[PDB]
Each structure stands twice: as structure tokens, then as C-alpha cells.
Amino acid sequence: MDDDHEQLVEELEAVEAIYPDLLSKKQEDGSIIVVKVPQHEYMTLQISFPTHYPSEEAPNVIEVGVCTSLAKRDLYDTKYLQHLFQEVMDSVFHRGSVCLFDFLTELDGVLYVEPEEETEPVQQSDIPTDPFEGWTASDPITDRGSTFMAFAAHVTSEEQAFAMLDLLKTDSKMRKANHVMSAWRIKQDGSAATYQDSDDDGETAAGSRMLHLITIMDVWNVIVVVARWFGGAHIGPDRFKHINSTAREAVVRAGFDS
């Protein structure tokens, strides 16, 4: 009856993460929800969360709905499925799991609709979302068809900057992009050992521009690499805007707004 809301709200964000479109919450923060059969059926299950939620006991199945015709409407009804649904919760009534995960297993077997026995996720992504060594990169952006991304990294003298970037630059994963550009700058905060020069790689017209760009942006002792990728139409709605907020934190953090 304490952080029960936090763990509850946590599973809400988890089921959300795993299956957004599939789940539909009637209430704001859990309380009552309507999830649909884990596969993608048509039978939606209405479930409430009592003060005796998973921790105390488990959720409350209040109703089920199903899109059917006269073909198999004689096999199972709403109140009927509710009965077996409840007996399923009985499983997720005493588990370390909250409900959503352990209750789907019973239905996964008993409800049939088993195509194959191999799961196949999607690890293929152009936009980099995984951290890098000595690198802080997280500014992918999206434009019509084109993906604009950048990698930032705080550095010491030019040797480190040159190597880490030399490597990333000659790396075939970064060569996957149509054309890549890079900018380096070393300016001793109080000393005089400074090194300046401009990269080009692809579009040389972009190099000095990018250099002056970082200069006017009030930033030094940090490197940035920009790459142009080709995805779909807009790749994704949440791609640019959402990751922008994220990217903003990264770019700034690495030392670009400092």
C-alpha cells in the first residue's frame, strides 16, 4: 500500500513498452484497463485494479468483449471467457510477477492460435540508440526520407580526438551512411596549446561550415560527427521530435552547450 503504485505504474509503462497499440487503458494510471489478446485477435479483456492489486492479491477481470459472428459464438461467450479468465488470474494471484506476463501463458496455450514456435524481434535500426565508448552520441534527427544524425565526444588534445574519430570515420558501419562529415577542435581553456583543422570526407562544402558552426555555437574541446542516412518516408513520427529532446541532453552533456 506504499510503492504499490510505483510498481503498478511501472508494469503499466512496461506493458506499454512491450505492447502499446494492443493495450488500452480506460483509466489514467492503471486503475482500469482493457487489453486485447496477446496475439492480435479481437477479444479484448476488461480488467480493473483493486486496492488489493497484484502485491496484495491480483487484478480484477470485470468483462471481456469479442468481435465474432455466428461461426464460433456458440463455443465461448463473454461471461464464459471471464470465468476462465478469472481462473487464469488465480495463477497470477501468487507469483512474483504482477499479472500481465504470467497470465498470458495460460491463454497462450489454451486459446490456441499458435503459428510457430520461434520469436523474431527487430534489432535492425539505422538511428543509433546504443551508447558508445569514449563517445556520447544520441542526436539522430529525421527529415523527409533523410536521417540526420550526430555523435559528440569530449576530448583532450588532438591525438585522442583524431584517433577515436579516425576510427569511427573509417569504420564501415559509419560508411553505411550516404555521406558523413566531422568536426574537431582543441582549445585550451587557459593554456595556449590549440589545434585547428577541418575535415570534409563527403561534402567539403559542409566541413568549414560545420567548423564555423561549432565555433559560433560556443563550444570546444569536443568533437562531433554528422551523417546522412536514407530511411523511409519520415521513418517515424516520434523519431525526430522525441529523440530531439533526448539528443539535446546528449549534445549538451558531452560538452556542446557548456
Side-chain angles (χ1 to χ4, degrees), residues 43 61 63-64 73-87:
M43 191 162 218
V61 309
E63 192 83 89
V64 303
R73 58 81 182 209
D74 185 64
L75 285 69
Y76 57 103
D77 182 80
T78 59
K79 48 75 60 60
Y80 189 80
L81 221 300
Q82 279 176 89
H83 272 251
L84 41 141
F85 211 55
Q86 200 287 275
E87 84 178 83

Side-chain angles (χ1 to χ4, degrees), residues 13-237:
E13 298 195 57
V15 62
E16 211 293 307
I18 315 163
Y19 359 65
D21 174 86
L22 182 77
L23 178 77
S24 301
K25 296 182 292 87
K26 289 301 179 181
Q27 297 304 271
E28 59 178 281
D29 60 285
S31 173
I32 305 198
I33 62 94
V34 171
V35 61
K36 178 166 58 184
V37 172
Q39 212 286 145
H40 201 263
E41 304 326 283
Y42 44 78
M43 191 162 218
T44 68
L45 312 316
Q46 163 167 29
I47 312 176
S48 186
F49 287 69
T51 312
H52 274 211
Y53 29 63
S55 317
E56 291 290 281
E57 305 198 85
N60 270 209
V61 309
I62 313 300
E63 192 83 89
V64 303
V66 60
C67 299
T68 37
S69 186
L70 292 75
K72 65 280 195 175
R73 58 81 182 209
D74 185 64
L75 285 69
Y76 57 103
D77 182 80
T78 59
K79 48 75 60 60
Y80 189 80
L81 221 300
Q82 279 176 89
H83 272 251
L84 41 141
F85 211 55
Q86 200 287 275
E87 84 178 83
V88 168
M89 294 296 172
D90 189 87
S91 179
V92 317
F93 224 96
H94 49 121
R95 302 297 205 195
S97 54
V98 261
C99 167
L100 64 169
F101 314 107
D102 186 80
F103 103 101
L104 60 73
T105 358
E106 307 296 289
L107 267 69
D108 167 83
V110 80
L111 207 152
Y112 306 124
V113 191
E114 47 176 83
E116 59 209 285
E117 287 168 86
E118 67 174 279
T119 53
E120 47 190 273
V122 53
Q123 298 180 330
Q124 276 62 90
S125 181
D126 293 88
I127 289 82
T129 56
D130 56 298
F132 279 86
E133 89 173 285
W135 266 117
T136 303
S138 282
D139 182 91
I141 307 297
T142 290
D143 186 62
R144 188 196 66 155
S146 305
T147 318
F148 283 97
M149 63 184 66
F151 291 36
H154 64 143
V155 311
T156 177
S157 301
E158 58 179 333
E159 297 179 75
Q160 170 172 276
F162 266 128
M164 70 183 305
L165 168 152
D166 199 76
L167 158 87
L168 187 121
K169 274 201 67 189
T170 46
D171 195 306
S172 183
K173 59 171 164 289
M174 189 50 56
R175 258 65 188 96
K176 294 286 101 65
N178 180 29
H179 291 288
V180 307
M181 63 207 70
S182 307
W184 55 68
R185 204 71 162 274
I186 324 285
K187 283 303 200 72
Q188 288 301 272
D189 287 276
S191 312
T194 63
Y195 289 101
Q196 309 179 91
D197 178 68
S198 181
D199 195 87
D200 69 272
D201 192 271
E203 41 187 277
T204 172
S208 192
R209 181 189 181 236
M210 186 176 181
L211 243 299
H212 286 254
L213 216 153
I214 65 176
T215 317
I216 62 182
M217 240 211 67
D218 285 292
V219 56
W220 297 271
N221 298 330
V222 68
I223 58 169
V224 52
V225 162
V226 166
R228 302 174 59 190
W229 254 279
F230 289 100
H234 226 107
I235 306 159

